[PDB]
Design a protein around this ligand. Structure first.
Ligand SMILES: NC[C@H](O)CO[C@H]1O[C@H](CO)[C@@H](O)[C@H](O)[C@@H]1n1cc(-c2ccccc2)nn1
Ligand SMILES: [Ca+2]
Ligand SMILES: [Ca+2]
Length: 132
């Protein structure tokens, strides 16, 4: 039995996957849906540091499933769940700044940054690990 698919990464009962091509934010969640996964929604502190590490050490700007397209200033994960105050420390200093209108969040260096959703970047999918 295999808890995660071929060449996916495993962490705390979940299966993650960093793309090796680039897409815009909407095309990215589509991509994850195509594999029965979701553009990552972070739920733990350790999950953040885990993903933030894989993303940085590959020197790749990476989409995550977080946006404010429901309403400006209201950051909300693609599962509807809101962005908790606890998680707001993971923004990069001076972010989110909404320079030129920016409604989607990405892994950039040590933390997160808001960028333009139509800007093409890499992405990370998340799904529940299978039971053995
Ligand atoms: N992958 C994105 C990468 O991290 C680059 O980040 C920067 O440019 C991104 C633009 O693509 C921003 O969305 C980030 O906020 C960040 N920025 C931009 C600015 C800024 C402010 C005033 C005038 C001009 C520029 N201040 N911070
Ligand atoms: Ca914004
Ligand atoms: Ca920004």
């Amino acid at each position: 039995c295999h808890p995660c698919p071929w060449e996916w990464t495993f962490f705390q009962g979940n299966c993650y996957f960093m793309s090796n091509s680039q897409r815009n934010w909407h095309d990215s969640i589509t991509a994850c849906k195509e594999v029965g996964a979701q553009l990552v929604v972070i739920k733990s502190a350790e999950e953040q540091n885990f993903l933030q590490l894989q993303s940085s050490r590959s020197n790749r700007f990476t989409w995550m499933g977080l946006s404010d397209l429901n309403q400006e200033g209201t950051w909300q994960w693609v599962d509807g769940s809101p962005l908790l105050p606890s998680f707001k420390q993971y923004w990069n200093r001076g972010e989110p700044n909404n320079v030129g209108e920016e409604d989607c969040a990405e892994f950039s260096g040590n933390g997160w940054n808001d960028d333009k959703c139509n800007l093409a970047k890499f992405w990370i999918c998340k799904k529940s690990a299978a039971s053995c």
